[PDB]
Design a protein around this ligand. Sequence first.
Ligand SMILES: Nc1nc2c(ncn2[C@@H]2O[C@H](COP(=O)(O)OP(=O)(O)NP(=O)(O)O)[C@@H](O)[C@H]2O)c(=O)[nH]1
Ligand SMILES: [Mg+2]
Ligand SMILES: [Mg+2]
Ligand SMILES: [Mg+2]
Ligand SMILES: [Mg+2]
Ligand SMILES: [Mg+2]
Ligand SMILES: [Mg+2]
Ligand SMILES: [Mg+2]
Ligand SMILES: [Mg+2]
Ligand SMILES: [Mg+2]
Ligand SMILES: [Mg+2]
Ligand SMILES: [Mg+2]
Ligand SMILES: [Mg+2]
Ligand SMILES: [Mg+2]
Ligand SMILES: [Mg+2]
Ligand SMILES: [Mg+2]
Ligand SMILES: [Mg+2]
Ligand SMILES: [Mg+2]
Ligand SMILES: [Mg+2]
Ligand SMILES: [Mg+2]
Ligand SMILES: [Mg+2]
Ligand SMILES: [Mg+2]
Ligand SMILES: [Mg+2]
Ligand SMILES: [Zn+2]
Lengths: 104, 129, 14, 88
Amino acid sequence: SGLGQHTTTAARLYHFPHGGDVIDSPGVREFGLWHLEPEQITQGFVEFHDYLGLCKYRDCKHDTDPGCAIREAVEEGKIAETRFENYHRILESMAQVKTRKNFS
Amino acid sequence: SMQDPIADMLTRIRNGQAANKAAVTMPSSKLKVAIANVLKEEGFIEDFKVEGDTKPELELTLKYFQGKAVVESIQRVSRPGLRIYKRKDELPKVMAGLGIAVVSTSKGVMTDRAARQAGLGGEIICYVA
Amino acid sequence: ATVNQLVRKPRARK
Amino acid sequence: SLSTEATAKIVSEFGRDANDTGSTEVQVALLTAQINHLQGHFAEHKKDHHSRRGLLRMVSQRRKLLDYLKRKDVARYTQLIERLGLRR
RNA sequence: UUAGCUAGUAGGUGGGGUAACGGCUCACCUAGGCGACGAUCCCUAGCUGGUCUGAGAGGAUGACCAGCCACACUGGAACU
RNA sequence: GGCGUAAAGCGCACGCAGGCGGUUUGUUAAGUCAGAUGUGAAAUCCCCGGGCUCAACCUGGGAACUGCAUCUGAUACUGGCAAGCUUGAGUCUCGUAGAGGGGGGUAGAAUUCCAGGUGUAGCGGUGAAAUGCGUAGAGAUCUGGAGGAAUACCGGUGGCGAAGGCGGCCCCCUGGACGAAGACUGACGCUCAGGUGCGAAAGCGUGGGGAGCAAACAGGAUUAGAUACCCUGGUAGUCCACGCCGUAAACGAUGUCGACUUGGAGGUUGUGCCCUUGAGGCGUGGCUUCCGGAGCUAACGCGUUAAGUCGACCGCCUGGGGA
Ligand SMILES: Nc1nc2c(ncn2[C@@H]2O[C@H](COP(=O)(O)OP(=O)(O)NP(=O)(O)O)[C@@H](O)[C@H]2O)c(=O)[nH]1
Ligand SMILES: [Mg+2]
Ligand SMILES: [Mg+2]
Ligand SMILES: [Mg+2]
Ligand SMILES: [Mg+2]
Ligand SMILES: [Mg+2]
Ligand SMILES: [Mg+2]
Ligand SMILES: [Mg+2]
Ligand SMILES: [Mg+2]
Ligand SMILES: [Mg+2]
Ligand SMILES: [Mg+2]
Ligand SMILES: [Mg+2]
Ligand SMILES: [Mg+2]
Ligand SMILES: [Mg+2]
Ligand SMILES: [Mg+2]
Ligand SMILES: [Mg+2]
Ligand SMILES: [Mg+2]
Ligand SMILES: [Mg+2]
Ligand SMILES: [Mg+2]
Ligand SMILES: [Mg+2]
Ligand SMILES: [Mg+2]
Ligand SMILES: [Mg+2]
Ligand SMILES: [Mg+2]
Ligand SMILES: [Zn+2]
């Protein structure tokens, strides 16, 4: 009615007419962020590399901290606010996934 | 209901013997007298009395050792649902000859030990163990 | 358990 | 079942005296008039299945009482079946 | 997870028939007969004395021995 | 051998056939029992032997073959017949309690809708918001009217009904249960395969009815997605008549009936007697819960309402999955 169905299975291999291979993917709605620290979440975005080390403090949550230069870049308009509000949704998701425990 | 009154008779004996009752009463009949009179002659009970003619009431005096059950267990064998009959040589013994088996024949109610000199067979009533 | 029940149908051997 | 005038009359109708009230032929007449009393009730009240249990009890009770007189003395049996309108 | 089956079918008369009784057969007459104590239908199987197992009661089975029935490529028929 | 929870008691009731049956006497000798005759081929097995140098094997006699038929006996029990008897099961009267069922009226709150009045910026909703609603005056309050369904308190392991179930009040029709005093019939009884009827709710057919609640569905949040949760609405349905469907964790997870076996705390409902010397004292039946001895059970627990000891009959289970 308003959703999508995952009929095709995990991965089937083929070949290009020129060269290389294809790998199909499942219909996946999962997000496993149990890998590393939230310092690696700062490295997971391209344009936020060039704006690190510009804020007030040497450690910063960038949400409730005064003088965030990354937040000043969003307020200027060089970074869209859709990406910034979704960025702290990633950080607040780690306050909700981490709850019980999981380790490899 | 009361379709097997001999089984009702054995029910009232086994309860009062185990529950340290001194004496019991029960509705009398011709067949219940002919069984209790044998048990009086075989040292299992003490005395029996009859009361009433329009309502025949049989009474039994119990028997103890030092407050222990003389009649340890008794087993109804034949029943209205399944009749049991044996011959003069197929009469079973109770506790390899210790207990007696009440068998009613045409010469009256007697034991299997008394039926050897009588040489008859018939209906097994109860295993007096 | 009843003998009169087994008159109608005996014990079913597997 | 009925009133006192309807109960005591039918006992005097079929009984030898006023004390002849426990016999089987009196007990058939108590059930025969009661089923005849409930003919117009259950026609209008077909959804009353709880009173129908009391009705079918008296039908089964009267059938067992007719079988006792029939197996003992058929002379009094053939009198009562036509005097009350039975055997259909 | 087979409930109705059956018209020579059930019975009677007479004729015929076989070594013997008999719907065994024929004409007629009657409408019964069978059956929830398994009729009928389907599937399987020679049966028994026995053997084997089991304390016994039971259970499984029917080779060799013996008794009986049936069969002799398939089906049908009669003679002697 | 089991069926409260390991697999299993039909959801319940009526009832034919079948099975079973109080007590006293007579008769029959059917069943059973006693004895006898005939028979149960031989072989096999068993008992004592013999023989092949032994054993296996062969073989003499006996036992056994628990079978069937007939005759002569006995009559305690069972069956049949006959006459009964009353404690079983029934009948009458006087009563009492109850949401037992069916039918027909009626009441007042509350909900929503509508009419009118006063009155103003939010109402509504949630963890927080939003959809939605409201300046055409919502919401709130008051007056009046309509419709629908359910009956607060009473009300409680309280009552009734075979069970599912059943609750405002009143009338009409009607069912059973129980108690007291006697009278009366005389086993008229128990049980149940098929058969028969009842049977929560959902759903189905026809025609009505329509507040509130509420599958599907509409909308807003939630979320990775929300299909669900949460919220605002809302059809079928819930209501009635007329049928059909007959399934539930239809459970006390205990089929019905009867007989006995130490007992308490109570509840409900009667009845009998008693300085009525208080709605009390003493008994005594019907219904019902919590404890608990003996006993039973695998434990849990049951334990005078048994799952204790017994009888009468019926249903059902045979490793799990497939199913
Ligand atoms: N109109 C239109 N339909 C398209 C287009 N591409 C794909 N579709 C349709 O979208 C549907 C989904 O395609 P599909 O490739 O099966 O999706 P998927 O992502 O592989 N599904 P899954 O998760 O099961 O593997 C199909 O019905 C396909 O025809 C397009 O460009 N236009
Ligand atoms: Mg009444
Ligand atoms: Mg002829
Ligand atoms: Mg063959
Ligand atoms: Mg041969
Ligand atoms: Mg077992
Ligand atoms: Mg189970
Ligand atoms: Mg039940
Ligand atoms: Mg021989
Ligand atoms: Mg010999
Ligand atoms: Mg020999
Ligand atoms: Mg030798
Ligand atoms: Mg007799
Ligand atoms: Mg109202
Ligand atoms: Mg009399
Ligand atoms: Mg429909
Ligand atoms: Mg919802
Ligand atoms: Mg409808
Ligand atoms: Mg079921
Ligand atoms: Mg319980
Ligand atoms: Mg104890
Ligand atoms: Mg207890
Ligand atoms: Mg299986
Ligand atoms: Zn910062």
